[PDB]
Ligand binder design. Structure first.
Ligand SMILES: O=c1[nH]c2cc(-c3ccc(F)cc3)ccc2cc1O
Ligand SMILES: [Mn+2]
Ligand SMILES: [Mn+2]
Length: 200
């Protein structure tokens, strides 16, 4: 039917915290969310995936990996992931250096998205409107010598991850995929999707 505004969609369908972090990210790099609107939506989408990836995952009081969906994360539990994406450059490198100097893991060349304290590795999260294998390769090309694990989601439910190691259980990955499908369906109802797919 009528064509919506991608700005309206972003502000309506993403949490304000996410929108704000994305606006700040874009300003930091000199890009205007009112102009690069498809990019704004992609940035919000990727941030949300990063948050959803780490949601509910802890390392227990005996120090192994568990899921707690209660809003009461009893205080002896360690969050399983450190989130790097969404931080400004200075803070992001501060966090990365701290992890590296601590855990002994090697320092990445570019900022990754997450650190996994269970698997003891950085993770790069991809979100793509294209074939996952193509985007996997591109990401890998920048990471090169790689201790950094890559995990790619598409909007159609396909995934590709380093060494066929998917890190998370099926239910967690299913939440992310359901959210991506919902984003695509909603863009489509506002006639925003075609343009957004093509602009990656
Ligand atoms: O980890 C990722 N980070 C990204 C960051 C951007 C980005 C591009 C321009 C900006 F002004 C701000 C952010 C665009 C795309 C990505 C894709 C990623 O996987
Ligand atoms: Mn990133
Ligand atoms: Mn990423």
């Amino acid at each position: 039917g009528p064509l919506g505004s991608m700005e309206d969609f972003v502000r309506q369908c993403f949490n304000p915290m996410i929108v704000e972090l994305a606006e700040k990210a874009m300003k930091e790099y000199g890009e205007d969310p009112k102009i690069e609107t498809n990019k704004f939506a992609a940035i919000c989408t990727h941030l949300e995936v990063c948050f959803m990836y780490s949601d509910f995952h802890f390392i227990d009081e005996r120090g192994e990996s568990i899921i707690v969906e209660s809003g009461d994360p009893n205080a002896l539990l360690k969050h399983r992931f450190e989130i790097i994406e969404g931080r400004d450059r200075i803070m992001a490198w501060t966090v990365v250096n701290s992890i590296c100097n601590t855990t002994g893991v090697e320092k990445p060349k570019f900022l990754p998205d997450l650190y996994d304290y269970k698997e003891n590795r950085f993770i790069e999260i991809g979100v793509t409107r294209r074939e996952v294998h193509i985007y996997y390769l591109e990401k890998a090309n920048k990471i090169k010598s790689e201790k950094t694990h890559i995990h790619i989601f598409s909007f159609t439910g396909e995934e590709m991850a380093t060494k066929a190691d998917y890190t998370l259980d099926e239910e967690s990955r299913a939440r992310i995929k359901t959210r991506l499908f919902t984003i695509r369906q909603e863009m489509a109802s506002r006639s925003l999707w075609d343009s957004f797919r093509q602009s990656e």
